[PDB]
Write a protein that binds this DNA or RNA. Structure first.
Ligand code: DGT
Ligand code: CA
Ligand code: CA
Ligand code: CA
Length: 341
DNA sequence: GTTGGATGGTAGT
DNA sequence: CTAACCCTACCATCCAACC
């Protein structure tokens, strides 16, 4: 079984360069403007020229403006990138209808049947990169392995505008040699628990007591890592299905005032309900980000679909429930829908 | 025991 | 207002209602 993974290069920023070809070769930074003050908010992403200077996805815009004053700062246009993204997903579809869209800019193809070996798979990767550059002038990075996880890694090892195979040989070695903190799914907190344990490599997990590992990182992660290690990982490529859709906004200033918070919450509901598109949710959750940025939420599942009217009425109740129970001012407010019929 | 709801932690993009 | 967006997946834990 062979799996090809495609992840587009500095996406949002690359789209901006294609739409505006003068930008290429200069620093470009795509920003989410929060509205709270001149340049309040965060960097969605930035091109490699910009990354050279410490400007990356996630930092605060005014810090980007600090460390790289003279770059090009562009406002995020999520719908433009999504149209490009849709056109590209359809290209990848030409190459295999067995596709798994994992986000705005990346996908896993199962190519077990288009190709007999890694060499052909490699050439298909080459055939892919070309088509996308032909049709959407977008460069991408391709990872090929026997499974999602190791394909992802191959891609990570090749960014930007690269293509890499990890063959059965490589897989065997990376199990023995690749730092554990580099396994997709193993973030900071986890990685820390694993070193206190003395597990630095995927292989280290084999020679430990399952119940001792579990009783540190959780069941799900423990099984997962051991599966990886035993080279028994075989999660198929499956058509992704949204489990929840929502929207959360940033207020002009922090409040506790229901009158002041309400138009933000309602804005979220409109956008959220519009993004649903013939989907009927049985569960609503109001989500609040506090002064000190701790995230907090109150929900309700009904036994039936929620109509836009129920959602309205319900989200106010729930926002009150937060305010009743947490006495910190609120900074961002939004809503989330789930359990679609 | 079962599942499944509320809330929150962790991870990733 | 003085930095920290935006969105979704999956999982753990704390309960409760129950086959
Ligand atoms: N608003 C916002 N958007 C983000 C954030 N992280 C990623 N994105 C968006 C912008 C990216 O172009 C798009 C794909 O992200 P990626 O993680 O794949 O990296 P990107 O393509 O930007 O650079 P690439 O070479 O992978 O590193 O997702 C974030 O923290 N906030
Ligand atoms: Ca990506
Ligand atoms: Ca990318
Ligand atoms: Ca990590």
């Amino acid at each position: 079984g062979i799996v090809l993974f495609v992840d587009f290069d500095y996406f949002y920023a690359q789209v901006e360069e294609v739409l505006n070809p003068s930008l290429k070769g200069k620093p470009v930074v795509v920003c989410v403007f929060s509205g709270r003050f001149e340049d309040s908010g965060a960097v969605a992403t930035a091109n490699y020229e910009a990354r050279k200077f410490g400007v990356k996805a996630g930092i605060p815009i005014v810090e980007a403006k600090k460390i790289l004053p003279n770059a090009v700062y562009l406002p995020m246009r999520k719908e433009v990138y999504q149209q490009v993204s849709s056109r590209i997903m359809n290209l990848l579809r030409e190459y295999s209808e067995k596709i798994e869209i994992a986000s705005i800019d990346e996908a896993y193809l199962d190519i077990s049947d288009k190709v007999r070996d890694y060499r052909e798979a490699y050439n298909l990767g080459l055939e892919i990169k070309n088509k996308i550059l032909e049709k959407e002038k977008i460069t991408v990075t391709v990872g090929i392995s026997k499974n999602k996880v190791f394909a992802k890694i191959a891609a990570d090892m090749a960014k930007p505008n690269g293509i890499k195979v990890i063959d059965d040989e490589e897989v065997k070695r990376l199990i023995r040699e690749l730092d554990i903190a580099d396994v997709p799914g193993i973030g900071n907190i986890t990685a820390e628990k694993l070193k206190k344990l003395g597990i630095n490599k995927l292989v280290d997990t084999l020679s430990i007591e399952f119940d001792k590992l579990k009783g540190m990182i959780g069941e799900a992660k423990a099984k997962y890592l051991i599966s990886l290690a035993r080279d028994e990982y075989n999660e198929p490529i499956r058509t992704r299905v949204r489990k929840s859709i929502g929207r959360i906004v940033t207020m002009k200033r922090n409040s506790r005032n229901l009158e002041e918070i309400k138009p933000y919450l309602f804005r979220a509901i409109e956008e959220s309900y519009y993004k649903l598109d013939k989907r009927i949710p049985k569960a609503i959750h109001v989500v609040a980000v506090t002064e000190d940025l701790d995230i907090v939420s109150r929900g309700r599942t009904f036994p039936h679909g929620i109509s836009k009217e129920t959602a309205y009425s319900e989200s106010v109740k729930l926002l009150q429930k937060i305010l009743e129970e947490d006495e910190r001012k609120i900074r961002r407010i939004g809503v989330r829908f789930s359990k679609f019929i």
